[PDB]
């Protein structure tokens with residue numbers, strides 16, 4: 030590792046506490062998330078050594094540094110293999126890259142304390158008390174940039190129908206990730222039963238379960254048939270506190286019946302949480318049907334794949350606005366690192382335009398793919414059986430989204446096509462560059478998912494044609 | 503690989519040119535470095551395909567963006583194994599980390615051209631012509647911060663005697679790395695003259711760069727001893743020619759001090775220029791300006807301390823008999839290649855570069871003497887203990903210390919490996935960091951079980967404790 034070094038916060042924190050070997054480590058910015066990992070390790074082994082070490086910048090007249098130059102280090106044995114929850118707990122609550130680099134530059138000015146009696150974890154920073162050589166370029170915890178973010182989110186979720194109260198800046202809550210935003214709303218509901226309705230983003234179910242819903246009613250497909258089961262349960266006296274769903278599903282691009290969901294919610298009295306990360310608030314008007322909207326700002330809201338953020342919009346038109354907002358406000362601590370909010374506030378200024386552009390290309394590419402003899406069918410909201418459902422929420426003059434998936438005729442052909450496709454490959458979506466993934470890596474199972482970026486239709490048409498050619502004998 | 507993604511500029515450029523598999527890639531900011539890599543591959547294997555693709559943000563209302571959002575991509579087959587030279591050529595000329603991240607964020611606004619007729623390498627950016635969302639925090643190519651860097655370097659290199667002309671801001675040249683600064687002075691001398699002398703400067707990219715710069719009669723003096731100075735003097739007196747002598751003031755990893763007084767005397771007689779690297783010894787602790795025509799420094803090291811910025815410096819001595827020739831060449835051939843964000847961090851972190859040298863050197867002196875007195879220690883290489891101490895005292899400023907680098911020669915190599923494995927400090931090849939860092943001879947490719955230590959800003963209590971516990975753990 031030749032200098033300069035990127036990353037290294039975990040290795041440097043391990044060295045500070047004399048544990049550079051024999052333990053696994055995770056770094057969160059909240060003591061609560063650290064505890065949720067400690068509890069999961071302790072449930073698998075009640076005798077496991079798990080320490081929680083708080084790092085913090087001890088003496089400074091600058092509240093910016095003192096508020097953000099802090100992190101929590103969690104040590105636990107390597108014998109513990111990480112399951113789905115600890116993956117999504119770290120995904121949603123792990124320190125951001127920029128926040129980690131900010132702390133590592135200031136680590137010499139920070140001290141470490143632990144509640145347990147381990148003297149190796151009680152360390153004084155070599156430069157604690159001294160003034161850092163550099164002040165960050167952002168100011169006031171990035172509150173200026175956070176308000177830009179909240180303002181754009183509030184404007185873009187405005188309903189095209191003028192009978193509803195508009196979402197305001199302060200009805201939007203910003204968190205570190207979209208996963209964290211989902212967790213925060215899950216605990217807020219926990220203070221009856223929770224329903225998961227056709228939401229295959231693999232991290233929702235673990236967090237809802239961890240938030241105190243031991244076993245939520247899971248409706249995997251999101252169909253009308255499953256809504257019949259839910260209504261049959263509710264009509265028979267069953268109770269429900271909250272329903273979680275996402276508008277425009279992954280990877281089949283299905284649209285749930287939000288109108289019927291909202292009608293059942295008004296009749297039987299549960300809260301509706303809708304994730305519009307894939308569907309987008311630019312393309313869809315879902316405010317009439319959702320009490321809380323969640324969004325992963327890391328995705329197309331940012332586009333540049335270089336910042337994390339999550340948002341929580343409380344609908345002022347909701348019957349539970351008062352209760353929900355008060356809980357979130359009364360339990361709100363700012364965990365969106367300012368440097369991340371600076372990039373998000375800059376990149377979201379053209380978030381409507383980029384959604385419009387990607388959606389135009391994705392609609393064209395999907396219809397191009399559908400016409401190819403090797404393709405069985407393409408999952409895109411203009412082709413799927415919920416085609417009529419999507420049109421109930423689509424805004425006039427807006428398109429059909431940036432995500433699609435390809436179901437090929439032959440699984441052999443699917444793999445040869447993916448390997449020949451000269452575009453970015455990985456699990457993220459909503460990027461400025463096009464990106465593909467098979468079902469394999471997403472933990473029919475030969476389906477290939479495509480998130481269309483800002484490249485021209487000719488460019489993407491060409492990359493796909495060449496890949497299609499090489500996949501045929 | 504979930505987003506955000508760090509790095510990825512190389513992967514993104516490869517995808518742009520439809521070469522995501524089957525080829526290796528390197529990214530430089532200069533076409534000349536690209537050519538020097540192309541030539542080394544073409545002589546090791548003439549039939550290997552090597553292309554040079556220029557990426558650039560052509561037009562912009564911000565001259566900051568257009569000037570810096572450009573880079574050179576070099577493609578070559580995976581069969582080519584990198585040798586010692588191509589490693590150090592990329593180390594000195596590779597795009598900086600911050601520069602790489604800046605380009606990747608703007609890559610959609612950039613186009614790619616190639617001189618050869620390969621249509622896959624002629625691409626238009628998806629957002630070419632559009633304006634980027636947000637601009638960089640730095641302004642005017644970081645000229646304000648670059649002036650701070652040059653000012654601090656000039657102030658710290660003042661000789662302790664006031665009859666010498668002082669180095670000014672405009673006698674200091676900034677480059678991307680210490681290695682690049684060494685390259686620029688090496689090629690500058692070659693225009694005048696064929697023989698270059700490398701005098702006790704091991705484990706570095708100087709020899710590859712000096713050889714690559716056109717010096718067809720190199721002389722390598724590995725130890726830096728007076729016996730090697732005797733051979734050089736006999737050669738020069740007998741009619742031998744010498745263009746330039748390269749040396750480093752405190753050597754790696756034995757902390758040796760060359761006889762700069764004798765070197766400067768030979769230079770005055772036979773008319774060659776002396777280039778001295780003071781990265782290890784530092785201008786804070788040492789006054790070597792009287793004996794050098796050009797001083798070079800790796801700003802990435804203790805000048806910055808924070809291991810989060812890249813930089814190199816070239817100081818032309820105004821008291822040099824060749825000041826005019828050297829300065830006009832360096833300015834007349836100057837391209838600003840120090841990425842502004844790197845210059846911003848360097849300008850901030852260099853404000854306490856004197857104090858940090860004073861702190862590290864004080865800790866390093868105490869730890870070295872602690873180690874030297876230990877029964878398991880054969881000897882410790884540190885300027886207070888080594889046989890060339892009297893030479894170090896010739897240039898040491900009064901009231902300043904003996905440096906931050908040391909190395910440990912243990913009695914038994916087995917003990918060395920158990921001590922190193924037990925040493926709970928950062929491990930790696932870099933030096934001049936705010937945190938202490940160790941390395942063995944293994945990664946360093948002189949006894950071959952040597953352990954090198956670059957002492958950071960931690961107190962002696964912390965460092966003595968880390969060393970004591972490792973010493974205990976090293977015994978069976």
Ligand SMILES: [Cl-]
Pocket residue numbers: 286288289
């Ligand atoms: Cl309905």
